[PDB]
């Protein structure tokens, strides 16, 4: 069996393991956290996709920025991102985290959590419905499914 075939399969196995065990750390800052709690509620039950309800920052694989990010809070958000073991992904939930939202022009609001941390998925809405957030998480799984770390390593 060629090396390009073994590495192709190993990518699927590790990609499958990582997207099937996405443990999120939720930064519940504002109203968008209430819709995040409704994704864990029986109606949608994020836990059945392998997404544990609450995970500690040192066990989490994805950070969900759910709510307005103010200047006072931005340093503590970066401090939690830097302490997250890799691979680490970031999901921006709602307009406030996306690009400032209703409070875009406020003196105390970070106009988008994507100028403090890198973002992998943007979920639009004020708030996004519990189903629209679940679409983002499932969209992050497909993004992780397309990763080719081992294949790219084998061609260096």
């Amino acid at each position: 069996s060629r090396g390009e075939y073994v590495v192709a399969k190993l990518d699927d196995l590790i990609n499958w393991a990582r997207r099937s065990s996405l443990w999120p750390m939720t930064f519940g800052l504002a109203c968008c956290a209430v819709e995040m709690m409704h994704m864990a509620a029986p109606r949608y039950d994020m836990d059945r996709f392998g997404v544990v309800f609450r995970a500690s920052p040192r066990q989490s694989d994805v950070m969900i920025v759910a709510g307005t990010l103010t200047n006072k809070m931005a340093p503590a958000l970066r401090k939690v991102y830097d302490q997250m073991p890799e691979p680490r992904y970031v999901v921006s939930m709602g307009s406030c985290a996306n690009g400032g939202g209703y409070y875009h022009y406020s003196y105390s609001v970070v106009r988008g959590c994507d100028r403090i941390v890198p973002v992998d998925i943007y979920v639009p809405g004020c708030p996004p419905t519990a189903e629209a957030l679940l679409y983002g998480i499932l969209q992050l799984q497909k993004k992780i499914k397309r990763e080719k770390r081992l294949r790219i390593w084998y061609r260096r």
């Binding site: 109606r43 189903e131 679409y135 499932l138 969209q139 497909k142 499914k145």
Partner: protein, 97 residues
């Protein structure tokens, strides 16, 4: 009595999907092996089912097509593959397919 009829409903789910192979296909794609009433099929291959004995929210479902717009969707099904005409019915915004 009802105990024996429960095990018979489980068996006829295998026959209602078209044999063991069809039964396993919907178990690994949709994680669900209920049998519903085929309400229609769209031009892309999605099949729409209903069962009004299921509680609200589970009485309408879509088994996505295995290929849409040239993309292999056997495992990669996405909620956005439902066309607008069936979007309204599948979300209970109307009663008419």
């Amino acid at each position: 009595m009802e105990l024996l009829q429960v095990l018979k409903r489980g068996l006829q789910q295998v026959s209602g999907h078209g044999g063991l192979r069809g039964y396993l296909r919907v178990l690994f794609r949709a994680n669900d092996v209920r049998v519903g009433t085929l309400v229609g099929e769209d031009k892309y291959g999605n099949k729409y089912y209903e069962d009004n004995k299921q509680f609200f929210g589970r009485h309408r479902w879509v088994i996505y097509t295995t290929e849409m717009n040239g993309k292999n969707t056997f495992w990669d099904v996405d909620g956005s593959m439902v066309p607008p005409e069936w979007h309204r019915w599948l979300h209970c915004m109307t009663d008419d397919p």
